[PDB]
């Protein structure tokens, strides 16, 4: 729900190049994608440990 709106804001604001918001857009991208990789990996490890309990 957060990623699908930040990426839509990225597609909206940079149809043409915006040099004033260019240094912050990269930080927002790095922050949200590094958050997502950690969350998805921990969700997979949790489901695996749950499957190994039967």
């Amino acid at each position: 729900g957060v990623a699908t709106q930040l990426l839509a804001a990225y597609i909206l604001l940079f149809d043409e190049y915006n040099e004033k918001k260019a240094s912050a857009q990269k930080d927002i991208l790095i922050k949200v994608l590094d958050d997502g990789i950690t969350k998805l990996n921990e969700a997979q490890k949790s489901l695996l440990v749950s499957s190994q309990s039967f």
Binding site: L48, S51, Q52, F54
Partner: protein, 54 residues
């Protein structure tokens, strides 16, 4: 004139052998079932990790 006690001792001694080896074999086959399911979980996790990297 009718040896019923030796008959009962023989029946119970032939029937205890079978109880002993059923109780011994069932635990070991259940342990092998647990080990095979654990090995299939480890196999899934390793090949899924390599798939996601590729």
């Amino acid at each position: 004139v009718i040896p019923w006690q030796t008959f009962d001792e023989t029946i119970k001694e032939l029937s205890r052998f079978k109880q002993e080896y059923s109780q011994a074999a069932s635990v070991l086959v259940g342990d092998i079932k647990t080990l095979l399911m654990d090995s299939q979980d480890k196999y899934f996790e390793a090949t899924q990790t390599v798939y996601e990297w590729c």
